[PDB]
Amino acid sequence: ELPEDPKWEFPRDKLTLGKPLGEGCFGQVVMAEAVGIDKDKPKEAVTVAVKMLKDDATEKDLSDLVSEMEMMKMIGKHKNIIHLLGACTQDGPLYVIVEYASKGNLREYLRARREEQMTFKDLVSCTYQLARGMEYLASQKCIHRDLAARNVLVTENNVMKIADFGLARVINNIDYYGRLPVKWMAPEALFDRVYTHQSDVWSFGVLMWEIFTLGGSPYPGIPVEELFKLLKEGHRMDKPANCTNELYMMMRDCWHAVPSQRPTFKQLVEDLDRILTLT
Ligand SMILES: */C=C\C(=O)N1CC[C@H](n2nc(C#Cc3cc(OC)cc(OC)c3)c3c(N)ncnc32)C1
The DSSP code sequence of the chain is: -----TTTB--GGGEEEEEE--STTTSSEEEEEEET-STTSTT-EEEEEEE---TT--HHHHHHHHHHHHHHHHH---TTBPPEEEEE-SSSS-EEEEE--TT-BHHHHHHTT------HHHHHHHHHHHHHHHHHHHHTTEE-S---GGGEEE-TT--EEE---TT-EE--SS-B---S-GGG--HIIIII--B-HHHHHHHHHHHHHHHHTTSPPSSTT--GGGHHHHHHHT--PPPPTTS-HHHHHHHHHHT-SSGGGSPPHHHHHHHHHHHHHH-
Q: Look at the chain and report how many structural domains it folds into.
A: 2
Q: Residues 30, 148: one domain? A: no
Is residue 5 one of the residues assigned to a domain? no
Q: Residues 93, 160: one domain? A: no
Residue whose Cα lies nearest atom 5 of ligand 1: it is 22
Instruction: Tell me which residue range forms the domain holding 191.
Output: 106-278
Largest CA distance in the chain: 60
Measured in degrees and rounded to the nearest 5, phi and psi for residue 119 equal -90, 170
**Are 100 and 31 contacting, i.e. CB atoms less than 8 angstroms apart?**
yes
Return the bridge partners of 99, or none: 48
Q: Residues 163, 135: one domain? A: yes
Residue 51: closest CA among 90, 73, 22? 22
Is residue 156 one of the residues assigned to a domain? yes
β pairing state of 15-20 and 29-35: antiparallel
- For residue 24, the ligand 1 atom closest to its alpha carbon is 4
Q: Report the alpha-carbon distance of residue 272 to residue 276 in Å, rounded.
A: 6
Residue 156: closest CA among 18, 49, 10, 63? 49
**Are 143 and 195 contacting, i.e. CB atoms less than 8 angstroms apart?**
yes
Return the bridge partners of 160, or none: 154
Is residue 3 one of the residues assigned to a domain? no
- Determine whether 5 is an active site residue: no
Residue 187: closest CA among 119, 269, 256? 256
- Which residue of 47, 99, 153, 156 sits with most ligand 1 atoms within 8 Å of its CB, as the best mutation to test the pocket? 153
- Whichever domain contains 272, its CATH number is 1.10.510.10
Domain endpoint, select from 99, 122, 151: 99
